[PDB]
Symmetry: D2
Amino acid sequence: CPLMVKVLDAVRGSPAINVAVHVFRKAADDTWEPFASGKTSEPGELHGLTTEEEFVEGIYKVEIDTKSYWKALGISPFHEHAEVVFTANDSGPRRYTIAALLSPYSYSTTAVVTNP
Amino acid sequence: CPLMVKVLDAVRGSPAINVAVHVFRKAADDTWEPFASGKTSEPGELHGLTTEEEFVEGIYKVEIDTKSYWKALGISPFHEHAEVVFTANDSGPRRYTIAALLSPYSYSTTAVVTNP
Amino acid sequence: CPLMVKVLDAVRGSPAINVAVHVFRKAADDTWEPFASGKTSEPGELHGLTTEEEFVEGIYKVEIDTKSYWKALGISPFHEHAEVVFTANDSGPRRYTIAALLSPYSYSTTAVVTNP
Amino acid sequence: CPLMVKVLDAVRGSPAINVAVHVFRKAADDTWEPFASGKTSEPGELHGLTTEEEFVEGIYKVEIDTKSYWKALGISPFHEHAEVVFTANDSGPRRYTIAALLSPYSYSTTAVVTNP
């Protein structure tokens, strides 16, 4: 698991469950290729998106469907979605945790990059 | 101003000056059309991007070139840019402030929406 | 102003109005001495807390009464208050802006420090 | 483990290791009693601070010595420390995760409160 996504809800102080996540990779065409997707589970995590073989250097985009999450709760949100765009670079083994902290009119995203 | 962007630097405790910002509007073809651009000035703000007449209902993207900002300081940051995507003016004209707080591996963005 | 406090609400996308703020300075006895207080006004700001002459070197505490803010809105929040503690003016006089972004279970605080 | 503390470094995109944490409980005297302490480990977590028997309803303070952490890295920080003050309330089983995201001039803190 070189790539993990974790989503938290700052209004309720809870993991954000059932949030759709889409991952894209920038293709030679300079367009965004579907790469992986999933919905967050009870602890607000999405595991198993990819494997070390497939997760080669490149530019990746992580799209989190925050608007549907707030709409389920009855809260009118500002953003259409939250996007995280980054380069993956070989340099030691790397694991990536992309964390997102959600409010209706604000979000924070942080990357924790560790080397096992 | 109907649209104002404010950018702060969490490492130095200072406004983020000379940050490039590009604004796009989603067209009828579902492509992103260039709408306005500029660079933050010394208080970390960008004003004058649009007028009330031009700033019609639509889906807008604000792209903040964070990577160039950190590289000019000697830091290799995680994100390629910070992107904020939102529906604007769909219940009438509003005034939008988009704020971004920058760190090398993390950013936060908040919207303040007022009714003129 | 040598000291300004700005408070935003991440749930509503709005400045946080009528929030009580108390400022304390650490005394020679290591107790917290009351220094200034006030309430945020409609743009979410509190000005006029002190003067350059009064705002000497020291350790200062800014206490933001977040709990009362959320309770007046019907929400039972996690934190009792938000506290910001910092050394001020130790290399000469500076101008401080203390910003706080509020959600029910999360808050962020940032300092912007400028040299007059 | 009803209480866990997790500390992240937004400059380096890493867990914040060896950060001192002190936990206090508000005593009948209305003063702060030492309750638990520790230093964060490699994944930036502090476990084992207390037990369900001892963690009764009350007001608790968590103090994170952020200033020493930045000083070790050669970065001049703004805050003396980060403080988190909250009430623990019986109402179902509750576990508390206090998360802190650190930058030199900014920090965020979030509570994730779950019921097993």
